[PDB]
Structure formats: structure tokens, C-alpha cells
Structure 1
Amino acid sequence: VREFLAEFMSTYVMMVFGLGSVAHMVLNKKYGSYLGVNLGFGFGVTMGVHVAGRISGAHMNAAVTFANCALGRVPWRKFPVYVLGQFLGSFLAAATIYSLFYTAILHFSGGQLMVTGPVATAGIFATYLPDHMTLWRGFLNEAWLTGMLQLCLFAITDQENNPALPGTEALVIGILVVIIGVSLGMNTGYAINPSRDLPPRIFTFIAGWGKQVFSNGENWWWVPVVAPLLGAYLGGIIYLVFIGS
């Protein structure tokens, strides 16, 4: 199916720019930036939309695919093909960054693929909640942040309201992902996307970071998987209730 390779290609490109920006922020502090993370993932989404926006819609996100189907906009038969396409692309993008930044991660870490400590590198690929946070509040943040993403996504592409001019939606959508990081990313790393979080964390477990990538943060791994699903659905519902009312 053409929507499989479209979701694969757009998610791969998006995650390369994304996870590469995060690797920059962690590895070097003269070449890395939290703002660069916001820009790398944001405008990384802009490139993916140019890749697959006209073929599959360029979801690059299992939450917005789940929310579109659960809202009667995409047939339920296309949910597995969309999810596996972005899961495979995100997995391969994690392997891409790991190999491109290999000696950079090695020299920085001295050869220790660590998840805790002042030299940890697991946070490049997946999300790990800071020490000041609780798992329930991380669920609340991921749900609310994905809700903001879905509500704002509908408004940018709503041809019956006030959408971005066609041919520029790629810009406005990337800017939304930029400011979601700038304004809401410190508390959880704004995963807002199961395809962005679980495939790279699965890669880190196989790569050699071990099993603590899953158990860190009171078994944190499942929250970026199900919390955005509830968030994206809730966000889309509130817009559709806001629209026509």
C-alpha cells in the first residue's frame, strides 16, 4: 500500500532530524541546544509533510492516526498499516542516528551506553521523565500536550475554518511542533507520539543500553504509547465540538 511507504518515508525523515537534534543537545553544548531540539523536530515534521502529506496525510504519529480513525475520518483498516509504517521508519531512523553519532556517543561516554549518570545517552532516542516529576503527572502532560497538537493540527488544515494557505501547511505544522517543545517540553520531553518514543526505545534495548530503558521512571515506557492516544482523541473531539457550535 502506498500509504505504508509514505508513512515510512515521512516518519524516517522526521525522526532523523528529530533524534539528531536531541543528540546534539546531549553530546556537545556548543553545537547543541534545547531550541535546536525544538527546531529539529518541528521543521523535521515540515519535511515529512512534504514527503507524505498528499499520499497518506503524513501522520508520522500513532496518536493522530488513532484520533483520525476514532473520529470517523480515516477507515479503521488503515490503522495497522499506518502504525507499522511509522514504527519501522522511526526504528530505522534511531539506528541511523546511532551509527552516524557512534564514535561521538562512544567518546562522550567513554564506551559506556548508560541510562543514568552525568554521561547517559539513552535520552537521545526516547523520553525519560525528570526527577521532579511523577508518573501520573507525566500521563497528564503527554495527554494534554498531544491534545494541543491534535486541536491545532485540525485548525491549521480545516478547509472550512481558517486554514494555512495550501502549499504552506508544512510550515505552520512544523512551527506548532516547535512551540510545543518550547512551551511544554521540559516536564516530559513532549513525546506526543507513540511512533516517536517506543520504536527508538526498543532500539536502545537491543543496541545495548539494557532493560532499564523500559523500567526507568516507574515503567515509564507505556505512557508515551497510550497517553497520546487519549490526548489526540480528546483534542480532536474538543475542536470538532468547537467547530459548528
Structure 2
Amino acid sequence: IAKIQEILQRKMVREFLAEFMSTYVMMVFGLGSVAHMVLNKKYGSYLGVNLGFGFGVTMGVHVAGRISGAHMNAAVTFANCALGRVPWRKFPVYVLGQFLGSFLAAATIYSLFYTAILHFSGGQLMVTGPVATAGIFATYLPDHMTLWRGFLNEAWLTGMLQLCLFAITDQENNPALPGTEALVIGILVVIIGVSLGMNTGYAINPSRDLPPRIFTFIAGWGKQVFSNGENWWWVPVVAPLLGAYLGGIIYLVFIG
């Protein structure tokens, strides 16, 4: 029976699906690189992680560049809505799509690397220790760092990201050539990972951090995912919003 295409032809359904697909592709590539690094030694490195995340963002921008802007980031959506560039009524649709895409990407990565995870871990799913595999999906605070240092790191990283994102795609200034923005955005993400990544895991995206943590909690890693490192789970959800807003307002006041 036809006529279901009427629903799939609305103006908000298309943007919801675009956000879903772009976030799914980006997260699959990024989490795959992270799993490569964690599990194997001859098939993984940090530069591989950076390349995977950055040039997954590139492919996401290609997938959903024109339909919805390819935010792929809840902090970016909040910053754009709060500066008047996007109406406030599009926030829930984008956030829901990004969260569903990230959750399903985590499930995909879990299914693809199952045997390797079991062989590496010894059969026990641990959040901490020498055989911890909960770091593949979410980000946990390092040994020497404290909570507020991580808050500062997340805020500053997201501010830098938003400043450069505004600078690249501004047509009244010196922008990237139309049709070549995806490469430059991927390079920006790669070098954010390269330069400022060891302190917190640079989970500068709430969608990159929370839905995978919920998946790891459900799939059998325990309740220690939320209470590890003095309840670290809420820093990557709050710090990026403030960072992105401050970076955007700085660029608009000074350079724009």
C-alpha cells in the first residue's frame, strides 16, 4: 500500500533523516578508529583516531550539507539557535536525530568488533583496569586530571571549534571555496584532535558522548560508567554549550 511517501516528503522529516544519517556515518567511522586503537597494537594509533574522526565529519557534511546544514553536534545547534541563525523550534528535531544516530552507531560498532572485544578483555566487561573496554564508546577522565580542569578543557576546545567553523563558512569574509568546505572542516577536526586531545579525549560533542554511554550501560558494562571519576558524565554535556556560544559571540563581535 502506497501513500506513505506523503509522510516521507515533509520539510521536517527530511531534516530529521539528514541529521540521523550524517551523525550515524560520522560516529561509525570515529568509534571504529577508537576501537582499532584500543584493541590491536599493529593496526592502531592515535593519528588513525584523529584521521577517522575528522574525515568521518567530512563524509557527514557531504551527506547532509544542504538539507539541514550537517550540524552533527548538539553544541553547534545550540550556538546557532541562540545567535538567531536558526529558529528555536528546530532544536528538538535535530537533537533527537543526532541521539538516535549515535546510539545506533554504537550498537553497530559493538556488533562488528564482538569477537575481538571478548578476546582482548578475557570475557569480562570492565570499566577500569588494564583490560578496560568501556573507553571505546565514551570518554572517561584520566588519572591525574580533575573535574574542573576537564570542564575548562571541554569549554575551550568547543569554543575554538565554533570560532573556526564560523570563519570557514562565512561568505562576507574569506571563506573556503564552495564545494571544498568538507575537506577543510575535516582537517579542522583532525588537528583539534592532534593538538588538544590527550587531556580529556576531546568529546566536544554531547551526541558523541552520551548515547554511547547509555548503550554501554545497557549492554552489560554496569552502572560504573556513570559514577566513574566523580560523576564525569555530565561535564561533556554542559561544557560544550558554553564553549560554542562564547566562541561564536567572540567571532561575531571581533572579526565579523
When normalised by structure 1's length, the TM-score is 0.98
Find the residue that maps to 1:199 and give its secondary structure.
helix
1:26-85 deviations in Å (ceiling 9; x for gaps): 000110111111000000000000010111111111000000001111100000000010
Shift of residue 185, structure 1, vs aligned partner: 0.6
Q: Distance in 2 between matches of 1:37 and 1:129?
A: 18
Residues in 2 aligned to 1:164 and 1:243: alpha-carbon distance in whole angstroms: 16
Q: CA deviation at 1:110?
A: 1.3
Larger radius of gyration: 2
Distance in 2, Cα, partners of 1:153 & 1:112: 41
Q: CA deviation at 1:243?
A: 2.5
Distance in 1, Cα, partners of 2:101 & 2:214 = 13
Residue 208 of structure 1: CA displacement?
0.6
The residue matched to 2:178 in structure 1 has which SS?
coil
Number of equivalent positions: 244
Cα distance per residue 1:193-218 (max 9 Å; x no partner) = 00000010010000111111111111
Separation of aligned partners in 2, 1:90 and 1:65: 16
| Long gaps (5+) in structure 1 | none
SS at match of 1:104: helix
What does 1:1-245 correspond to in 2, within 5 Å?
A: 1-244=13-256
**1:163 CA drift (Å):** 1.0
3-state SS of 1:217 partner: coil
**Cα offsets for 1:71-105 (capped at 9, x unmatched):** 11110000000001010000000000000001110
After superposition, give the CA deviation of every residue in 1:123-166 in whole Å (9 maximum; x if it has no partner): 00000111110100000000000001100000110111111111
Same amino acid, percent of matched pairs:
100
Q: Write out the 4+ residue segments of structure 1 that deviate beyond 4 Å after TM superposition.
A: none
Give the match's secondary structure for 2:43. Answer: coil
